[PDB]
From Swiss-Prot, chains A, B:
Residue positions binding Ca(2+) 1: 19, 22, 24
Keywords assigned: Acetylation, Calcium, Cell adhesion, Cytoplasm, Metal-binding, Nucleus, Repeat, Secreted, Zinc
Main location: cytoplasm
Gene: S100B
Annotated Gene3D superfamilies: EF-hand
PROSITE patterns found in the cross-reference section: EF_HAND_1, EF_HAND_2, S100_CABP
Stretches assigned to the EF-hand domain: 13-48, 49-84
One BP term from GO: positive regulation of neuron differentiation
N-acetylserine modifications at: 2
Protein name: Protein S100-B
Species: Bos taurus (Bovine)
Biological role: Small zinc- and- and calcium-binding protein that is highly expressed in astrocytes and constitutes one of the most abundant soluble proteins in brain. Weakly binds calcium but binds zinc very tightly-distinct binding sites with different affinities exist for both ions on each monomer. Physiological concentrations of potassium ion antagonize the binding of both divalent cations, especially affecting high-affinity calcium-binding sites. Acts as a neurotrophic factor that promotes astrocytosis and axonal proliferation.
CDD domains attached to this UniProt entry: S-100B
Length: 92, 92
């Protein structure tokens, strides 16, 4: 329910930083993307926590729209991650 | 920051319903997708609120992975929407 729109109004804030927290405008880089998973998904700070997904979570981090992670990207990759991390998404 | 992972743990909950709130397993349909934007982004309940985006927000709702909106999809489309709605994403 609203949990999504509200979580959505929160990302517009996350990008605000993740996008303009160094110099880029509204996009990100394979490096900032990592911070996005380490500054929010500490569980992945270890990564090993998920070897099969470490392959998936990384399968995208290596591409990231090939270049920088823009608006629908951080929300995307973060999604490909969170979904492959530990939660409802596929049991957990 | 964490605002994203936490908002991420919230979507795993949103899908739980949006995905298994009728019969489907972990996916959605152009119809449930609408509820996802109307049950959270009331502002779009009117849609007219954004004619140019109503075209975009809909440009995806019509495709939605062509069929059903799965995990990375709701997070995706909801993103394409929220980003084209009113927030940091492109000024607002």
């Amino acid at each position: 329910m609203s949990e999504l729109e509200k979580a959505v109004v929160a990302l517009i804030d996350v990008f605000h930083q993740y996008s303009g927290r160094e110099g880029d405008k509204h996009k990100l880089k394979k490096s900032e993307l990592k911070e996005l998973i380490n500054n929010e998904l500490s569980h992945f700070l270890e990564e090993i926590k998920e070897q099969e997904v470490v392959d998936k979570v990384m399968e995208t981090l290596d591409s990231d729209g090939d270049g920088e992670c823009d608006f629908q990207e951080f929300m995307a990759f973060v999604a490909m991650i969170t979904t492959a991390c530990h939660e409802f998404f596929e049991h957990e």
